[PDB]
Amino acid sequence: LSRNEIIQSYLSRQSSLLSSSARQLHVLVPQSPPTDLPGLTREVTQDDLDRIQASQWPGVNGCQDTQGNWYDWTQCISLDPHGDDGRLNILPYVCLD
Amino acid sequence: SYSPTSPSYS
Amino acid sequence: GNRLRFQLELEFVQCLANPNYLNFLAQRGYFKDKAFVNYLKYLLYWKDPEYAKYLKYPQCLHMLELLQYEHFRKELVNAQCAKFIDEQQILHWQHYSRKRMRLQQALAEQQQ
Amino acid sequence: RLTQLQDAVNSLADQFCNAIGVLQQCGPPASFANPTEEYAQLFAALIARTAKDIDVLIDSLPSEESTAALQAASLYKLEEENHEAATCLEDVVYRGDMLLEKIQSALADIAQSQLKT
Amino acid sequence: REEKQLEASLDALLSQVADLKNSLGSFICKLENEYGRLTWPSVLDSFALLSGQLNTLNKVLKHEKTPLFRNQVIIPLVLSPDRDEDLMRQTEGRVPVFSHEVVPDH
Amino acid sequence: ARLPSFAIPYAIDVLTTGSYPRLPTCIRDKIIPPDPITKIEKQATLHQLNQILRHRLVTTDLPPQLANLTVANGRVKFRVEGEFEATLTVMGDDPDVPWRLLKLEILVEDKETGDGRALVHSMQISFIHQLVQSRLFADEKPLQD
Amino acid sequence: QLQKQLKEAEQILATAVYQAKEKLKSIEKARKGAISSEEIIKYAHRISASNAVCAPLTWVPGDPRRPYPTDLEMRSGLLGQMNN
Amino acid sequence: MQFDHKKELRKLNMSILINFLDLLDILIRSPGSIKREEKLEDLKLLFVHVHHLINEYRPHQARETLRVMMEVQKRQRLETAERFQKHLERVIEMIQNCLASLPDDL
Amino acid sequence: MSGVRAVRISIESACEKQVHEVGLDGTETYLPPLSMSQNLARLAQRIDFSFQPSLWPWDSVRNNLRSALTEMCVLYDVLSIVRDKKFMTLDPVSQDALPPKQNPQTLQLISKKK
Amino acid sequence: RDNLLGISWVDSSWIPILNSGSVLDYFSERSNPFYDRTCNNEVVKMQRLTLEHLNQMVGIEYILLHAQEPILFIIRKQQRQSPAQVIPLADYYIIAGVIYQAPDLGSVINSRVLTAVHGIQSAFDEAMSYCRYHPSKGYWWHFSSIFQRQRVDALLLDLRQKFPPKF
């Protein structure tokens, strides 16, 4: 368990950084006081069903991001939260093949 | 080295 | 009782998904008996959803179908058969999962 | 995005255990080193990054405008529309099959005439 | 001395096995290439001598003042999943790349 | 406590049907031989081949001196009444598939010269068959050739 | 030329309607397919709770986690234990 | 039961980080306290909830991704129907032009 | 969520691409070309016009002789692998196959008899 | 206990935790057909300390012979009459955490010849049943050129030269 060799330690940094990874960060989403079923008691409201299918809903159907680019659940978001060349890589939600 | 290979050795 | 029958049959069908156990049975000559093919034909009741609801290891069902072709049991007595089938099974499994993950990650990193 | 969020939360817990196990096991003795200080800065930065990433995946993750009610309504509408679309497409295939049968017979007749001449 | 004699007996056994294998191979290949026209006298003419001569020779060799074979033991040394082009040539195509399965199997 | 991917469609496939569409099929291709088509299929495929042969004939310039052709549900049966009997057929797509001579029966059958026999060694008939087949396999202009 | 064009059109129609028939076959499987979603979620959790539906994050060529009930699970498994 | 799944997930993220900071305050001030055992239980409970919400965003990842799945299948069926409709129009136009050229040439 | 109501949700089989063959060291293979227009000619190839070569008579004899040959060959391979010190040994552990019975006489007798 | 050569014994837990130091322990797990309680490694574990005690008390001492780090670990069974006196009894080799007994160069060959020749004998008996004989007919189983062909071959070569093959 001694490890601590400069080489052994250097491998640890690369492996850990790879798994993890001007703002280009997602738009802040605030409080959600009316939830569609329990919070607003608006179960089966037809506008909500229409909005989810085609309209852009910030958190039900996608992630807004900054710079305006809209990323849907199936798509993968590439963003750069730190001020460095390396960019965080959001992957897909539906991941539907 | 040479652990028993469930998938083939690379 | 019928409960013990159900439990033993479930365990046996879930165990059939093992190529090692299949090669075991094929070498020991259990497949050559005309009783085992009728038992397999009876075991097809697991295809129903109410019975498939209790199957923890689902990989067996497809395999079971192959056992009905009457050419799968004549072969598979070889150990290379179990080798190859387990190889392809584990390869499909692990490669599908990790390859989807790695492809997504690598494409996201390269496009940036 | 969901498996990414799960792996990000697990990486947060792993960075917690790694940060304490590093910054307690290794340190300059005392006075009544610099590599350890660098390690502390790097660990703090990584934990802060992971937190920001989890928030972005979550600011993103679904709004509680689903999981019930709208799910059932949408699946019922989708079943109805799947039925009607199947009917429409099978009607279109019927039209195409009639057209293909007509064109197939037409040559069957051109070829018969050309062979009879 | 005894080791030299043991090796000589081993080589003789190798020769016998090789000959028997060759004979069997030729026989089955000829059966598959002839199929028809083959008749019982010829089939008996080939099976009998091919088997009788080789088997009698093997038993005779095993029992003529040769080293005691139950004494020696075979325990695998190195196994490497590496591709080998020499064991494939030496065993004439079967048993390539001495893997883990092959030592319990053989 | 964390789930993996939540199965996505794997659970749906088992419940909806049963034929596992995952892993490799090479199992069945290498271990299980394919089942042959029944006579109903035979007739339908031969009728499709009849239509394809009609198209190929109306496109190809069939020689006008004889060209006695009958679809025979699978073979054009090119047979001059007293001189030769060839059976040409196609193997697939009309643009570039070659022909298949299949039969090379010789019609010259005299009962005054050849009694209780043909008129030429079968081996020579098969040689001419393979020669003319390789010659037609070039997709030149075969009905005339 | 007309005949050739007609034949090409026929081939197009054929492929199109064959694909339409494939879609119809899917629709016939789908009709019987409709079932409870909760049941689908429970079955997915059942098949995915272990290392069966998804390969594990750290699963290299050498793992006791197998696509089958191993041999120790078989040794305590009802099957042969009760047959004995 | 207000059960917002994004607000409470952000709350649980921030609660996990602040309880880690309070565990650092335990390790600074009084390591022999009882509370650290509670604290080493406490954030565990928090971590359980952060998984338990996103799973519930997972019979919803299921039901919601399932929702998108069915919509995508319906869209693909509509696209195939449109392609057939367009293909049929193209074929009808081809037949009409070819027929005019036959009698126009006549 | 407090009492989720399951409705009749229909899902289509996810058969967009199949992995006919899976090779080692990754390398996925998508053999399935998903065609029919050519599949008709492919099936026409199967159609007739007129398991080894014939292999209806003497199949048992053929298989038995093949198996005997294979055992002979395996023994020869092991002997050739002992012929050298390449991945093998031959250390003679001074032992003695001690048979605690009159097995020999009885076996000889029965064998000769049958 | 029927045939020690035909038995294999294993255990999954000990498999990942296997190293040159632990091979003897794996053989020693007990309830292992190959090893025995009578062996002195057992009397040592029962007592205390394992050092040059195998050279002091001389007897049944299972000792590792050759070792490959990942899987291969060969064990030898010795019977010592005195220090610096070793008598080898048998060899048990462990491949992939699976213990087998090393086959004798001769017991293996005897079994091998027996199976091959038994197969040949079954094939022979079966072949004997089908041959049927008559003196008039000869043997059977229980299941040319008209010489006008030289001119035909000349015509074949002539049409070859006239109509060349265009494969």
Side-chain angles (χ1 to χ4, degrees), chain A, chain B, chain C, chain D, chain E, chain F, chain G, chain H, chain I residues 1-46 51-114, chain J residues 1-47 50-167:
Chain A
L1 186 140
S2 70
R3 307 160 196 174
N4 276 62
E5 279 203 330
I6 321 166
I7 309 174
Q8 287 196 45
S9 70
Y10 269 100
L11 299 172
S12 81
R13 285 96 221 211
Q14 306 197 13
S15 53
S16 66
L17 278 183
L18 286 191
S19 71
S20 74
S21 60
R23 283 176 162 184
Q24 194 187 184
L25 212 146
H26 273 54
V27 131
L28 189 274
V29 178
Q31 45 175 358
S32 300
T35 67
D36 296 18
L37 192 214
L40 204 47
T41 73
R42 68 174 210 266
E43 147 171 359
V44 308
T45 299
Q46 171 81 182
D47 283 357
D48 327 356
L49 177 63
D50 295 349
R51 269 226 283 161
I52 176 188
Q53 290 171 34
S55 97
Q56 289 189 353
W57 205 320
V60 181
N61 327 344
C63 316
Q64 211 313 255
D65 193 22
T66 39
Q67 298 173 11
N69 323 5
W70 168 273
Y71 298 88
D72 66 37
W73 296 116
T74 67
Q75 285 157 353
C76 343
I77 320 187
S78 69
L79 101 146
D80 180 26
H82 335 272
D84 295 291
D85 186 359
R87 276 202 160 76
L88 207 260
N89 284 300
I90 300 180
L91 257 34
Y93 197 86
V94 201
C95 244
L96 227 177
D97 219 31
Chain B
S1 53
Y2 197 11
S3 69
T5 53
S6 330
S8 174
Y9 158 67
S10 63
Chain C
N2 298 339
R3 295 174 64 190
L4 305 182
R5 294 177 67 191
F6 170 86
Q7 292 198 6
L8 289 183
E9 278 149 357
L10 184 143
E11 299 272 17
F12 176 76
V13 183
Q14 293 177 335
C15 280
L16 190 148
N18 172 222
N20 288 326
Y21 185 57
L22 276 184
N23 186 28
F24 187 89
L25 290 185
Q27 288 187 352
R28 261 76 171 169
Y30 286 103
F31 292 163
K32 282 207 169 187
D33 202 308
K34 297 186 177 183
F36 200 84
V37 303
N38 298 339
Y39 183 70
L40 288 172
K41 285 282 298 181
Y42 152 74
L43 271 186
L44 262 290
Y45 76 104
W46 285 104
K47 277 237 251 74
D48 301 358
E50 57 261 50
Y51 291 108
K53 191 204 169 185
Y54 304 105
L55 278 159
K56 184 178 179 180
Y57 284 54
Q59 294 177 335
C60 69
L61 288 91
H62 170 263
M63 216 66 184
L64 180 62
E65 293 177 350
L66 274 297
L67 263 63
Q68 294 177 335
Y69 275 95
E70 273 288 335
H71 195 282
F72 197 77
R73 286 185 261 92
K74 196 198 297 181
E75 280 203 34
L76 186 137
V77 190
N78 301 117
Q80 315 178 312
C81 171
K83 169 65 61 153
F84 167 81
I85 176 71
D86 210 35
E87 283 283 325
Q88 273 195 349
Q89 281 188 2
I90 300 186
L91 269 181
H92 170 269
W93 186 39
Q94 194 193 180
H95 185 85
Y96 195 67
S97 159
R98 282 293 84 73
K99 182 70 167 65
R100 178 66 183 270
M101 188 175 178
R102 288 179 205 173
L103 190 139
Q104 207 61 32
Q105 275 203 357
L107 188 56
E109 285 201 4
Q110 283 175 40
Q111 283 212 12
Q112 64 180 20
Chain D
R1 273 171 205 184
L2 274 152
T3 47
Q4 263 207 344
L5 199 145
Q6 293 177 328
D7 217 27
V9 172
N10 265 29
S11 158
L12 196 83
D14 187 275
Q15 269 151 28
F16 282 165
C17 86
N18 210 330
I20 287 184
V22 161
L23 296 165
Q24 79 77 23
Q25 167 193 17
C26 79
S31 179
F32 274 60
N34 29 118
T36 296
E37 199 173 18
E38 171 48 37
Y39 267 41
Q41 298 159 38
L42 196 33
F43 271 113
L46 296 214
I47 290 174
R49 312 171 22 160
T50 37
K52 187 48 169 185
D53 293 340
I54 292 168
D55 185 8
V56 171
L57 289 162
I58 270 167
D59 275 319
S60 284
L61 146 140
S63 195
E64 191 8 68
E65 322 277 279
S66 286
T67 81
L70 278 295
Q71 294 300 320
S74 86
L75 70 88
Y76 197 51
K77 183 178 179 180
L78 285 174
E79 187 80 358
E80 304 154 350
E81 295 210 14
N82 279 151
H83 298 338
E84 69 93 11
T87 53
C88 166
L89 70 89
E90 75 185 4
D91 294 0
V92 176
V93 182
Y94 150 80
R95 311 177 201 172
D97 292 3
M98 293 299 108
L99 288 162
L100 181 128
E101 288 160 29
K102 285 190 173 182
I103 193 180
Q104 183 81 325
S105 61
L107 184 276
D109 297 4
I110 304 165
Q112 286 153 22
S113 86
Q114 192 184 5
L115 69 90
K116 275 175 184 176
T117 43
Chain E
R1 192 192 60 90
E2 185 221 322
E3 173 288 334
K4 302 292 161 173
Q5 141 173 237
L6 185 172
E7 202 295 335
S9 148
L10 183 293
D11 274 354
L13 229 247
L14 211 291
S15 335
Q16 279 359 113
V17 150
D19 249 351
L20 166 30
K21 197 241 9 294
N22 180 323
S23 151
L24 256 199
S26 163
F27 176 71
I28 192 40
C29 169
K30 162 259 235 242
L31 241 197
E32 254 132 351
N33 266 38
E34 277 206 279
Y35 233 75
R37 124 181 182 91
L38 213 10
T39 182
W40 172 246
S42 37
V43 166
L44 180 58
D45 263 312
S46 42
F47 245 147
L49 193 266
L50 87 86
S51 298
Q53 186 173 355
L54 302 156
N55 298 337
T56 53
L57 285 181
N58 281 227
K59 184 178 61 181
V60 156
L61 206 143
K62 189 157 188 166
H63 59 218
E64 45 114 11
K65 207 197 60 59
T66 61
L68 197 68
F69 273 147
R70 314 170 293 106
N71 275 28
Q72 264 77 23
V73 124
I74 345 150
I75 15 132
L77 243 245
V78 293
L79 275 294
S80 72
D82 186 34
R83 275 286 287 101
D84 197 351
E85 281 71 31
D86 186 38
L87 287 173
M88 174 217 58
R89 185 210 209 161
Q90 209 245 4
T91 60
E92 314 303 320
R94 306 163 300 275
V95 57
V97 303
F98 228 21
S99 332
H100 38 183
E101 184 156 41
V102 76
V103 178
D105 215 38
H106 263 276
Chain F
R2 63 156 299 178
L3 265 292
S5 61
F6 207 74
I8 334 287
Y10 278 77
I12 312 163
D13 153 73
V14 192
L15 299 173
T16 53
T17 171
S19 74
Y20 262 0
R22 215 13 73 93
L23 282 131
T25 56
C26 313
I27 317 151
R28 170 177 289 189
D29 307 292
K30 292 186 181 186
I31 304 166
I32 305 300
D35 295 354
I37 63 177
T38 200
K39 298 180 180 59
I40 293 93
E41 262 91 344
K42 287 186 175 182
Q43 303 158 313
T45 48
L46 267 298
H47 183 74
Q48 299 154 15
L49 275 184
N50 288 174
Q51 182 70 88
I52 296 177
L53 270 175
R54 289 177 184 268
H55 293 309
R56 173 79 85 165
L57 285 168
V58 302
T59 50
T60 324
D61 43 340
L62 55 88
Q65 308 127 74
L66 262 127
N68 280 47
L69 75 168
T70 61
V71 300
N73 87 16
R75 304 149 190 86
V76 290
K77 284 189 70 66
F78 285 162
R79 170 219 153 95
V80 16
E81 31 74 40
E83 295 178 359
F84 204 72
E85 161 69 278
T87 59
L88 267 182
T89 186
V90 286
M91 186 56 210
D93 56 86
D94 213 18
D96 215 353
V97 70
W99 304 63
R100 303 145 57 186
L101 203 32
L102 288 195
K103 191 182 189 183
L104 279 300
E105 186 178 2
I106 339 236
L107 273 262
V108 252
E109 33 85 68
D110 194 54
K111 300 284 156 128
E112 285 69 25
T113 326
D115 2 51
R117 212 150 288 165
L119 202 245
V120 115
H121 230 359
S122 49
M123 65 102 77
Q124 295 85 0
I125 289 170
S126 45
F127 173 58
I128 301 171
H129 175 203
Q130 65 91 50
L131 187 142
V132 180
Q133 190 141 347
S134 69
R135 284 196 74 257
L136 67 92
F137 247 80
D139 300 80
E140 198 196 5
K141 206 55 187 305
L143 242 308
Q144 272 291 342
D145 285 291
Chain G
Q1 291 197 351
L2 164 265
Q3 195 305 313
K4 291 176 282 108
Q5 296 207 143
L6 155 137
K7 141 51 20 179
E8 143 257 310
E10 149 84 4
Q11 199 128 182
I12 282 146
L13 215 220
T15 53
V17 310
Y18 137 56
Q19 143 258 146
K21 265 130 169 248
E22 143 258 296
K23 226 118 353 230
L24 209 211
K25 217 113 350 113
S26 84
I27 274 24
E28 294 147 0
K29 305 307 163 57
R31 289 309 152 263
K32 328 156 183 173
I35 44 184
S36 149
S37 56
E38 294 184 276
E39 172 162 71
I40 300 193
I41 295 174
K42 287 186 177 184
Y43 185 68
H45 164 261
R46 177 203 197 94
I47 66 170
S48 87
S50 57
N51 302 328
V53 59
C54 180
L57 283 299
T58 181
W59 189 97
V60 286
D63 275 305
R65 342 152 207 190
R66 279 313 260 262
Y68 52 81
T70 73
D71 203 70
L72 200 56
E73 162 125 303
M74 292 204 350
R75 265 166 278 171
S76 18
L78 255 240
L79 224 216
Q81 256 228 261
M82 285 329 126
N83 289 145
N84 283 312
Chain H
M1 297 312 310
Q2 191 280 342
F3 246 80
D4 176 47
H5 275 270
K6 292 174 72 187
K7 182 205 316 183
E8 291 192 338
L9 267 173
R10 211 162 289 115
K11 216 164 180 187
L12 282 179
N13 183 19
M14 202 62 212
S15 279
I16 279 172
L17 277 151
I18 296 314
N19 281 44
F20 184 70
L21 282 173
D22 292 22
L23 192 143
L24 281 195
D25 271 26
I26 294 290
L27 281 193
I28 283 176
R29 285 184 181 173
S30 157
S33 176
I34 179 57
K35 302 184 191 174
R36 58 165 287 272
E37 316 266 8
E38 265 198 353
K39 219 65 176 197
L40 276 181
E41 180 263 1
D42 200 13
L43 62 92
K44 181 199 166 43
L45 165 65
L46 285 191
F47 267 118
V48 161
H49 273 110
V50 185
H51 278 288
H52 171 51
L53 298 189
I54 59 185
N55 292 2
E56 261 175 334
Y57 248 8
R58 181 89 61 79
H60 151 90
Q61 140 135 119
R63 68 211 138 196
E64 177 248 339
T65 64
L66 283 179
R67 185 215 86 262
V68 341
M69 189 172 320
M70 277 340 281
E71 293 181 353
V72 159
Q73 183 57 56
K74 178 196 75 274
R75 172 258 300 176
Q76 290 164 342
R77 299 179 199 185
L78 293 173
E79 284 176 339
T80 61
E82 170 263 345
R83 293 156 195 173
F84 202 126
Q85 251 213 320
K86 108 177 309 177
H87 273 235
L88 172 155
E89 295 312 350
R90 191 302 181 76
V91 164
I92 285 193
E93 159 192 299
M94 176 173 303
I95 289 178
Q96 160 208 9
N97 92 4
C98 267
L99 179 153
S101 287
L102 280 4
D104 191 25
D105 287 20
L106 297 195
Chain I
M1 147 252 346
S2 256
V4 182
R5 180 187 48 90
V7 225
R8 233 49 181 182
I9 292 136
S10 194
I11 308 172
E12 182 147 320
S13 171
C15 160
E16 49 117 72
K17 250 155 91 183
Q18 222 147 28
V19 36
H20 156 56
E21 160 67 303
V22 208
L24 309 146
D25 300 86
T27 83
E28 261 340 59
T29 94
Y30 285 67
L31 243 238
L34 323 205
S35 159
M36 145 272 143
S37 71
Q38 294 87 18
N39 187 34
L40 60 93
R42 296 175 225 160
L43 296 174
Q45 194 276 327
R46 288 222 277 142
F51 188 70
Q52 215 203 24
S54 263
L55 250 287
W56 230 194
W58 314 22
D59 181 1
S60 58
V61 220
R62 166 249 204 192
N63 243 294
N64 284 38
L65 243 193
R66 178 120 96 275
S67 149
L69 180 167
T70 220
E71 146 64 7
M72 254 343 305
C73 240
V74 145
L75 173 122
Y76 168 102
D77 290 346
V78 149
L79 259 249
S80 151
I81 256 160
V82 175
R83 152 64 87 43
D84 311 313
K85 294 346 194 33
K86 220 147 48 143
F87 333 101
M88 218 19 100
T89 39
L90 191 80
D91 94 298
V93 145
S94 262
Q95 213 246 311
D96 36 70
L98 47 94
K101 214 234 225 176
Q102 49 65 221
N103 309 9
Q105 301 68 61
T106 26
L107 229 290
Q108 235 62 347
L109 206 224
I110 275 8
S111 189
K112 267 282 169 335
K113 291 211 171 317
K114 280 146 149 243
Chain J
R1 281 197 182 186
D2 295 332
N3 195 359
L4 296 185
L5 283 169
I7 305 186
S8 313
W9 172 85
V10 258
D11 197 322
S12 317
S13 356
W14 226 286
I15 292 184
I17 182 60
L18 213 272
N19 49 86
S20 57
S22 64
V23 190
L24 237 296
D25 288 345
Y26 189 32
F27 212 63
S28 178
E29 293 177 350
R30 245 293 303 268
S31 76
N32 164 35
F34 309 96
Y35 124 111
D36 42 24
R37 307 96 182 268
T38 71
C39 89
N40 317 342
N41 310 335
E42 268 320 280
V43 188
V44 149
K45 186 181 63 185
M46 153 223 251
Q47 246 234 344
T50 149
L51 251 333
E52 69 283 304
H53 307 317
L54 9 120
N55 325 316
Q56 301 167 356
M57 200 266 143
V58 274
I60 318 135
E61 326 282 343
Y62 295 94
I63 188 55
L64 196 147
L65 188 151
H66 174 272
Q68 199 198 35
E69 276 306 320
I71 51 162
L72 291 171
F73 289 104
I74 301 100
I75 314 297
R76 176 211 287 244
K77 179 178 181 175
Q78 321 177 340
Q79 173 45 273
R80 287 204 194 192
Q81 306 166 320
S82 81
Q85 284 185 323
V86 184
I87 303 179
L89 262 290
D91 292 329
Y92 306 93
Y93 65 99
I94 303 182
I95 292 177
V98 190
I99 313 186
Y100 320 91
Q101 184 190 178
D104 306 358
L105 194 44
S107 303
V108 118
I109 304 195
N110 291 327
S111 139
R112 284 311 210 167
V113 165
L114 148 81
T115 64
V117 197
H118 172 265
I120 299 183
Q121 155 66 49
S122 304
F124 159 77
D125 191 26
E126 185 221 336
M128 195 272 316
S129 308
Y130 302 119
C131 46
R132 310 305 303 232
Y133 170 81
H134 197 273
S136 319
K137 260 192 173 180
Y139 299 90
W140 65 96
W141 296 120
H142 210 309
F143 310 120
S144 80
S145 164
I146 67 160
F147 277 102
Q148 212 257 337
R149 181 177 65 83
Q150 73 276 59
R151 333 202 67 189
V152 188
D153 294 332
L155 161 71
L156 284 185
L157 273 292
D158 175 285
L159 62 94
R160 295 176 64 186
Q161 303 147 38
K162 263 49 154 186
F163 289 84
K166 300 136 50 204
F167 9 77

